Homo-oligomer: A and B are copies of this chain.
């Protein structure tokens, strides 16, 4: 007898893939959990049923009606959190607090869109801006609208957020009336599949609105057509491979990418060791290094501090990192669990060795015995902190990402903005999801933030006045844009209402006033 083979949901039916499948395992205990397989699926019908029946069914509803369905899904997921936490513990090896980012982060994001969606109203098209006169006598005018794309939304998701990656994307997709096919990363696919199964079993959404495929991705892009959209999250390397596909190069399907990002944290010149902003910086660096063992795309990887502050920074980080206990998330004493897999454990350790060739290791608690875990079975890596004294000439600092509990600190020469050098150094990341900045002076934060804006999708400013209210460097608030230029993928997600454009076509309607009036009665946009 073998572990459960998880079924796919395609063309409105639960269908097992054929063969022995791929086993998912517990990254702490090594226990075999479940299996996945996409072998032998009818991908043509999987895509046609979603596109035709799923799409027609969703578009038949208004925005408000679809939002009401999202609100029902929220209630359902909320009721089954107990099941989800147990899966997260086993499949991902994350502490309860860290699992919560995925599970409760996911639910929060979905609820936010349910609430926002109600404000889109009882219509089948959205109003983009206002009418513009095209005539001296105002007889002829233009009004832009958004209409749902007559395609499917294919989500190729990363291993780190099986729950949040699904709902962050599915909420604006379904709100926009676009049917979803999700393809979660294999290693941690279990939570994704269970959530989809719960939602599908509940019959909240019409048949074809939500489908799931786990296992091999072979054949998926071959089914993508010109009105479909694809949202990919993962490595820059994989993203480039996807971009070459005929689905995009020949058929022009939309593709959003979130990829590698060496996110920066900048300690401002005024934030000296004696000031409150200093402590906030130390706290934020440690949090981002350790939450999910640093396995967030937005985690701080590069921390830039004034030359004068380098030694006190390292000392403070060492002291705080020392309190981070590592091991089995089932133990209450554990502050940080495992990476997602032994494979990731290997990648991360190789990355640490690579960085070490060009950087000094200031902190490494590898020798500390794991709590309730066997170091030889678990995918636990202890926090590692590097120092790069010459970031201008550094060969790896600005280029090599270690997707684990690892970051590098580098001094900058204080100067124009005092932080001008740090801004240039951040820019060397070649485009990032987020930069955070730390100062005692709220009047200083704006100018610095604008200097970072063209190279960072989000700039997150932490200061004493917001010690209790700031929402976290790495946490993605759904009302704010997520994504970044250059290496980070050039993508955009979330940002509240901004998320809808990806799922719509914008059209200019030019017509007599009375025609603009009648088309306008059939649209809505929030005040």
A residues within 8 Å of B by Cβ?
124-125, 129, 132, 134-137, 139-140, 142, 144-145, 147-150, 226-227, 240, 243-244, 248-250, 252, 254, 257, 430-431, 442-443, 445-447, 449-450, 452-461, 463, 465-466, 468-471, 477, 479-482, 485-487, 489-490, 492, 495-496, 498, 505-520, 522
Q: How far is the CA of A135 from the CA of B479 in the complex (A)?
A: 12
CB contacts (< 8 Å) of A517 on chain B: these are 443, 446
Query: Nearest CB to that of A461 among chain B residues?
Result: B511
CB contacts (< 8 Å) of A450 on chain B: these are 124-125, 145, 147, 509, 519, 522
Beyond A147-B454, A449-B509, A481-B507, 12 additional pairs, beta carbon < 8 A:
A139-B465, A148-B454, A226-B487, A244-B244, A249-B249, A445-B511, A446-B514, A453-B505, A459-B508, A463-B512, A463-B515, A465-B512
Copies of this chain per assembly: 2
28 A-B contacts (beta carbon < 8 Å):
A134-B477, A134-B480, A135-B471, A137-B469, A139-B469, A140-B470, A140-B471, A142-B479, A145-B453, A147-B453, A226-B431, A240-B249, A249-B249, A252-B257, A252-B489, A252-B490, A445-B511, A446-B519, A447-B519, A449-B519, A452-B507, A454-B505, A457-B506, A458-B510, A460-B510, A465-B513, A482-B508, A495-B506
Knowing A132-B479, A449-B519, A514-B443, say if A461 contacts B249 (CB, 8 Å). no
Q: How far is the CA of A249 from the CA of B237 in the complex (A)?
A: 10
Contact check, A461 vs B226: say whether CB atoms are below 8 A apart.
no
Contact check, A132 vs B496: say whether CB atoms are below 8 A apart.
yes
Contact check, A458 vs B507: say whether CB atoms are below 8 A apart.
yes
Give A5 Cβ to nearest chain B Cβ, in Å: 36
Query: Nearest CB to that of A473 among chain B residues?
Result: B510
CB contacts (< 8 Å) of A498 on chain B: these are 129, 144, 506
